[PDB]
Amino acid sequence: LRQLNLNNEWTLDKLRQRLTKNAQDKLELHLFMLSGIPDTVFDLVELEVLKLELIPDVTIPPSIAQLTGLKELWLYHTAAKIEAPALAFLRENLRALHIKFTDIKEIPLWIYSLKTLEELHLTGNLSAENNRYIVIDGLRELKRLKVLRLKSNLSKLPQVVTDVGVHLQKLSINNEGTKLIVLNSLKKMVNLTELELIRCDLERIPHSIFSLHNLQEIDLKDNNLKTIEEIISFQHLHRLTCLKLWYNHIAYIPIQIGNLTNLERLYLNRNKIEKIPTQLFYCRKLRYLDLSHNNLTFLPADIGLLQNLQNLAVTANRIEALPPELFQCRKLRALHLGNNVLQSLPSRVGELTNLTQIELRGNRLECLPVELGECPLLKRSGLVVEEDLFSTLPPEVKERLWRADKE
Amino acid sequence: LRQLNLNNEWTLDKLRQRLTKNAQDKLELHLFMLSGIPDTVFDLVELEVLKLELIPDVTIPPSIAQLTGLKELWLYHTAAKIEAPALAFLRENLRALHIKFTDIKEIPLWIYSLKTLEELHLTGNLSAENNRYIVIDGLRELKRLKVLRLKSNLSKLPQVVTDVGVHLQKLSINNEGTKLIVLNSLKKMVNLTELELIRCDLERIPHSIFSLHNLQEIDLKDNNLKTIEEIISFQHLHRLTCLKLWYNHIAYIPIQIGNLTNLERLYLNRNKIEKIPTQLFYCRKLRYLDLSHNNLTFLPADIGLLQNLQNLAVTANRIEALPPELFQCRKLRALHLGNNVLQSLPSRVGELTNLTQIELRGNRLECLPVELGECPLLKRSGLVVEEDLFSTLPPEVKERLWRADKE
């Protein structure tokens, strides 16, 4: 009766109100704390992302076949039991699938029978007792799976994952405070294009990566390296396009990474950098950099060799002026100089019209120039300049900046 | 009472607004999980695609004669019982019967009296115990079966299909990861115009494809292939005009790919290709060169030889620069060039008058050339480029471009 009441209670009109848009401009429905699943939810064909969160006693009716745009279904803490015609429909229609659970209790069985899906995101503790990678032994039949994010506090790499990966393309590893035992088993699996390692507390980058020549995006965030004698061994790999080593504790970055001109992204913010020598910056074509919250006394000169920048950061450190070497660069769009001690502002940095988003709030500048008055490109919603001296700025400068907040 | 209630819930005026249009611009009526098939549906006189999906145990009444435009009878999972005058109506009238199914009772036992059938796709697994293809042993009775699309997961090509093959022309065998062991059974089949071994896990192209002399449209999608060395034997086929090679694992191409001058729509996309030979441009009839999402480091210049080329799509490659003689082609209709690592577009793109959609979202374009506004047929909607990169155009030039957009 409650399920029948839910259908009449949730009208299509009320549901259309609940539809929002996600990052991909796709229509998402957030079903939050519903005792059942309304058939009116499957009535509305405009849905794309079906977020059903902590919904118990789920029996997904095949009226979902009438829903047209469904490529995402977000199963959070749900014991799902789908019907066979719905199985047939989602085998040809669904394209991504996120699953959150508490061990075997909320892991569903119909997920394996769907063999055409691309994205299979698994959330919840899979490191359960007495079930050491034996539940996921039924993943072998999946040959179309290319994106597989594994965030389940895994202890070891499953051998079944090694068997299945032959047709994989994207893989992400999140351990949230657990030392993974990789044991160099990645030599088998060659097709992999994107690999990520977040907060593994390793300090020792494995060797099986170098046998793979297809990795373009490598994310090693919060790995806390201190002496990277690995970027002399990363010279073996000639596919990595953007290294992501941010929120580490790098004491000094070893110079050899200067030889990879294909590097385009230097994420190194919130670090313990004391001095970083020059030859790091022999690569010219780096766009995004982040160096916030450091102890650097001067930004090294051969960053001046970098001519293809888009973002930097001098946040919360002991740098008082922008060197002429940084003025040899011509592509400073974004920066992060807020809550800092920058004193002198020359005309070279100020004439950079394409300044996209520079943090400057809390900076210890002396006075702000009248060069923030006229042009319709560099303005407040772009550049958040220090508001203590924005008051002493002329009202026409404030006109440009408030124009940013309007235009 | 059931039919009266059914008609009351879904009256002719109710389904009049429900009248929708399909891809073929024929009127369609998606009847889904409805208790019976209504007579108010039949009161229409121009429905061409009767979409009968999951309607359990219903007798089609004589009122179906009102559907004068009914060419395609889409029977999906529907237990359909029908009377003798309408069986005769089927043997003399119906030209297309598009069947999705799961059971040999869902497929009806009165379509083998049907004779005027000219189009049909079967969708649904057919591998069953003691009841294989005795269902469609009336294919021999079906003397006009030219279109036979099979998303039916057949483990082997039926021999009754071969005996039909005197008039069979299109065989889209989407086996969903099952190999079609042709075993030169298509050697007997000397009259085909098309063959599509889609997702059939070949890894080796059979000789039954080459042995013919009437094939025109060959589509080998997702076969995990490595080498295409066998096209020297393709010179026997004098009518091949298209090879859509979608989603394969090809490491490299040989040079003899240039031999097939008869090729028009040569697809080589979603591959691991690192080198395209100059010999490849020996072909002169190439019309649809879709090289989307590839590993091509640069567009070769000799591609200017293709004077019939209309839709050249090279999105998401690693293409650095565009050579000049690339722009010798003027018949280009859809240049999808996005997600590249291109630094700039040469001014010869302003020479393009047929420029309708050029995808520049990405690349490294400092400023758009003004000549992009010169293209008359190009409107602002067709100019797929980032707004920040787009905004460099002059004010009255933007006024003319917006005038073209609103016209």
Side-chain angles (χ1 to χ4, degrees), chain A residues 101-118:
Chain A
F101 46 81
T102 301
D103 56 78
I104 189 55
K105 173 65 190 59
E106 288 160 332
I107 289 172
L109 186 48
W110 96 285
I111 55 173
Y112 323 120
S113 42
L114 213 177
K115 295 188 300 301
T116 59
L117 59 104
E118 172 46 278

Side-chain angles (χ1 to χ4, degrees), chain B residues 96-361:
Chain B
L97 183 76
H98 310 240
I99 322 177
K100 197 168 178 181
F101 50 81
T102 302
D103 194 13
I104 305 169
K105 311 184 193 61
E106 292 182 11
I107 324 168
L109 292 189
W110 40 251
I111 71 154
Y112 328 119
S113 68
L114 171 43
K115 309 171 189 181
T116 43
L117 210 55
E118 268 289 355
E119 188 173 21
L120 169 141
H121 43 286
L122 303 187
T123 304
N125 304 344
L126 220 63
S127 298
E129 174 188 355
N130 298 347
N131 260 331
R132 205 181 182 184
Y133 315 135
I134 319 296
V135 198
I136 47 171
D137 264 353
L139 282 204
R140 272 248 185 94
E141 302 299 318
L142 286 178
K143 227 59 179 183
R144 296 180 187 172
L145 193 61
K146 302 167 186 179
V147 180
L148 174 45
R149 199 169 318 152
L150 280 157
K151 192 184 177 180
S152 295
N153 210 322
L154 310 166
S155 300
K156 196 191 300 293
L157 202 59
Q159 197 267 335
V160 61
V161 160
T162 73
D163 294 350
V164 165
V166 187
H167 41 273
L168 173 59
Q169 292 185 337
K170 176 183 169 185
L171 208 50
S172 294
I173 325 165
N174 182 15
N175 278 335
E176 308 121 300
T178 299
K179 80 226 183 306
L180 190 91
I181 318 173
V182 61
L183 216 55
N184 65 56
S185 58
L186 216 64
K187 167 62 194 201
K188 310 179 269 167
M189 291 311 112
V190 283
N191 212 26
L192 284 292
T193 58
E194 298 186 9
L195 178 73
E196 293 71 54
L197 289 168
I198 313 292
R199 198 201 150 161
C200 286
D201 213 2
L202 271 53
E203 303 161 357
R204 273 303 150 262
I205 317 175
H207 304 89
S208 58
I209 315 192
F210 326 133
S211 175
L212 314 192
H213 67 279
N214 194 6
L215 284 183
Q216 296 193 1
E217 272 282 349
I218 305 172
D219 189 355
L220 302 164
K221 174 177 178 174
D222 206 8
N223 286 1
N224 301 8
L225 177 147
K226 297 180 179 300
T227 57
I228 73 176
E229 275 258 4
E230 303 104 319
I231 84 161
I232 185 177
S233 306
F234 261 134
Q235 67 200 11
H236 304 92
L237 276 152
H238 304 301
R239 272 167 267 188
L240 182 44
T241 50
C242 171
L243 302 183
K244 290 192 172 191
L245 185 41
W246 271 338
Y247 289 78
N248 275 256
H249 304 301
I250 312 175
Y252 67 102
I253 321 175
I255 65 178
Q256 57 222 20
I257 184 64
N259 298 354
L260 303 183
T261 62
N262 317 315
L263 266 202
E264 299 188 359
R265 313 163 57 93
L266 169 162
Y267 289 44
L268 264 167
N269 51 299
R270 321 317 167 82
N271 293 342
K272 314 302 166 177
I273 294 162
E274 51 181 7
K275 206 272 302 300
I276 278 179
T278 62
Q279 277 84 14
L280 180 141
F281 306 105
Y282 289 172
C283 327
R284 294 187 177 182
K285 297 183 198 173
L286 291 178
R287 196 170 194 187
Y288 288 70
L289 227 40
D290 179 16
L291 252 200
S292 302
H293 314 85
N294 271 88
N295 301 25
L296 261 297
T297 70
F298 74 109
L299 274 195
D302 290 29
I303 210 157
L305 288 168
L306 312 178
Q307 287 303 319
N308 284 340
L309 192 57
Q310 278 193 322
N311 293 9
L312 168 89
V314 283
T315 41
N317 300 344
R318 212 193 175 186
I319 294 172
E320 286 290 338
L322 296 187
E325 152 203 49
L326 155 75
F327 299 105
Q328 298 265 70
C329 303
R330 297 308 199 272
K331 214 184 169 189
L332 293 163
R333 300 289 180 160
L335 299 92
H336 313 118
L337 325 172
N339 284 26
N340 232 327
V341 290
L342 277 150
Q343 63 293 129
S344 179
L345 265 293
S347 63
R348 301 192 53 171
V349 77
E351 302 166 351
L352 304 183
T353 309
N354 300 340
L355 190 58
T356 53
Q357 179 192 12
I358 170 172
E359 292 185 355
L360 304 182
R361 207 161 305 268

Side-chain angles (χ1 to χ4, degrees), chain A residues 138-373:
Chain A
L139 299 184
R140 156 82 285 179
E141 281 286 336
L142 326 177
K143 297 178 301 295
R144 281 275 298 270
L145 186 53
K146 293 167 180 181
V147 183
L148 181 63
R149 150 221 291 192
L150 293 173
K151 181 186 163 59
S152 299
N153 202 99
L154 312 173
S155 299
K156 300 192 290 285
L157 193 64
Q159 193 267 344
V160 55
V161 164
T162 72
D163 298 338
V164 172
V166 187
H167 35 259
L168 211 56
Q169 291 187 357
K170 187 173 183 167
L171 175 78
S172 181
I173 304 175
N174 296 340
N175 300 153
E176 46 269 2
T178 302
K179 180 172 174 58
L180 208 83
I181 314 185
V182 193
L183 220 57
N184 278 354
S185 64
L186 314 190
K187 294 186 170 180
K188 179 70 65 182
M189 151 56 214
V190 196
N191 199 30
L192 160 83
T193 52
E194 300 174 7
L195 177 71
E196 296 171 3
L197 291 173
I198 306 296
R199 204 193 131 187
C200 282
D201 215 356
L202 290 185
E203 170 53 32
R204 292 171 187 175
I205 299 178
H207 294 87
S208 51
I209 313 182
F210 319 135
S211 172
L212 322 185
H213 38 261
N214 294 335
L215 286 176
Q216 311 116 17
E217 300 190 13
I218 285 297
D219 195 352
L220 299 178
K221 172 200 183 177
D222 207 4
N223 287 19
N224 304 356
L225 330 169
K226 291 164 181 52
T227 63
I228 320 166
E229 313 312 309
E230 173 47 279
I231 47 189
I232 194 77
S233 299
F234 262 125
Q235 292 169 351
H236 298 90
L237 164 70
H238 290 284
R239 185 74 163 263
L240 173 52
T241 65
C242 44
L243 59 91
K244 311 173 203 168
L245 306 164
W246 81 90
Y247 271 69
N248 292 356
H249 301 103
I250 188 59
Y252 86 107
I253 303 74
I255 45 167
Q256 41 260 38
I257 190 49
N259 308 132
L260 299 189
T261 64
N262 319 336
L263 156 58
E264 297 176 348
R265 184 129 32 84
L266 191 146
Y267 279 174
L268 282 188
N269 62 342
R270 219 292 293 269
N271 264 274
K272 277 191 191 175
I273 178 64
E274 281 315 334
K275 64 164 293 298
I276 169 176
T278 78
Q279 171 60 234
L280 289 320
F281 296 112
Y282 221 78
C283 321
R284 314 65 191 165
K285 331 172 207 165
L286 290 105
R287 285 177 272 153
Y288 295 170
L289 299 69
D290 213 359
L291 321 173
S292 297
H293 316 297
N294 283 330
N295 325 298
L296 197 41
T297 52
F298 74 104
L299 196 56
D302 155 36
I303 294 204
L305 210 56
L306 277 58
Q307 289 306 128
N308 274 17
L309 309 169
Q310 283 216 19
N311 192 16
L312 320 182
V314 201
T315 325
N317 67 338
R318 264 66 71 200
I319 291 189
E320 333 295 313
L322 301 152
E325 287 99 4
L326 212 60
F327 296 150
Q328 174 187 34
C329 328
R330 165 222 61 61
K331 225 174 151 183
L332 314 180
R333 281 73 208 91
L335 312 78
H336 309 285
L337 325 191
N339 44 86
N340 210 34
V341 287
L342 163 69
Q343 292 272 50
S344 186
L345 198 68
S347 69
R348 185 52 201 74
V349 53
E351 84 203 14
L352 289 171
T353 321
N354 215 47
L355 215 67
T356 44
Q357 191 172 6
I358 166 167
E359 195 197 8
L360 280 156
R361 294 302 241 264
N363 205 355
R364 291 175 47 193
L365 297 150
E366 293 172 356
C367 64
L368 283 187
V370 300
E371 269 65 27
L372 286 177

Side-chain angles (χ1 to χ4, degrees), chain A residues 86-135:
Chain A
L87 184 59
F89 173 80
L90 278 316
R91 284 175 180 181
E92 58 191 355
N93 154 272
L94 173 157
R95 184 38 21 67
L97 182 46
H98 290 46
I99 303 161
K100 180 183 302 175
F101 46 81
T102 301
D103 56 78
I104 189 55
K105 173 65 190 59
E106 288 160 332
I107 289 172
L109 186 48
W110 96 285
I111 55 173
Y112 323 120
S113 42
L114 213 177
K115 295 188 300 301
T116 59
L117 59 104
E118 172 46 278
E119 307 178 17
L120 199 59
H121 296 223
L122 287 167
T123 314
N125 316 98
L126 279 169
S127 51
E129 187 175 355
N130 292 345
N131 284 320
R132 295 290 306 195
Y133 323 114
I134 204 178
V135 188

